[PDB]
Swiss-Prot record:
Gene Ontology molecular functions: potassium channel inhibitor activity; toxin activity
Similarity comment: family membership: Belongs to the ergtoxin family. Gamma-KTx 1 subfamily.
Keyword annotations of the record: Disulfide bond, Ion channel impairing toxin, Knottin, Neurotoxin, Potassium channel impairing toxin, Secreted, Signal, Toxin, Voltage-gated potassium channel impairing toxin
Post-translation changes: After protein storage at -20 Celsius degrees during a couple of months, the Met-35 of a small number of toxins is naturally oxidized. This oxidized form is about three orders of magnitude less efficient (IC(50)=15 uM) than non-oxidized form.
Written domain comment of the UniProt record: The presence of a 'disulfide through disulfide knot' structurally defines this protein as a knottin. Has the CSalpha/beta fold, which comprises one or two short alpha helices connected to anti-parallel beta-sheets stabilized by three or four disulfide bonds.
Tissue expression notes: Expressed by the venom gland.
Annotated site location: May represent the binding site: 13
Note: The affinity of the toxin for the channel decreases as temperature increases (Kd=7.3 nM and Kd=64 nM at 22 and 37 degrees Celsius, respectively), likely due to changes in the structure of the channel binding site.
Origin: domain of life: Eukaryota
Protein name in the entry: Potassium channel toxin gamma-KTx 1.1
Main location: secreted
Role according to the record: Blocks human and rat Kv11.1/KCNH2/ERG1 and Kv11.3/KCNH7/ERG3, as well as rat (but not human) Kv11.2/KCNH6/ERG2 by binding to channel outer vestibule (S5P domain) with a 1:1 stoichiometry. Inhibition data are the following: hERG1 (reversible, IC(50)~7 nM), rERG1 (reversible, Kd=6.8 nM), rERG2 (irreversible, Kd=2.8 nM), hERG3 (irreversible, Kd=4.05 nM) and rERG3 (reversible, Kd=38.1 nM) potassium channels. The toxin potency is not affected by elevating potassium ion concentration from 2 to 98 mM. This toxin only blocks channels in a closed state.
Amino acid sequence: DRDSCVDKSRCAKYGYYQECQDCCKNAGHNGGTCMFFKCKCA
């Protein structure tokens, strides 16, 4: 119970990264955003 895509799935400089939004959505949400190589949810 400690997945956290933020510290698992990489990302680009910033914006929309299909990789990030995919992770979150797969976790049990809708998606997320990209923040300085960081993967956050929405």
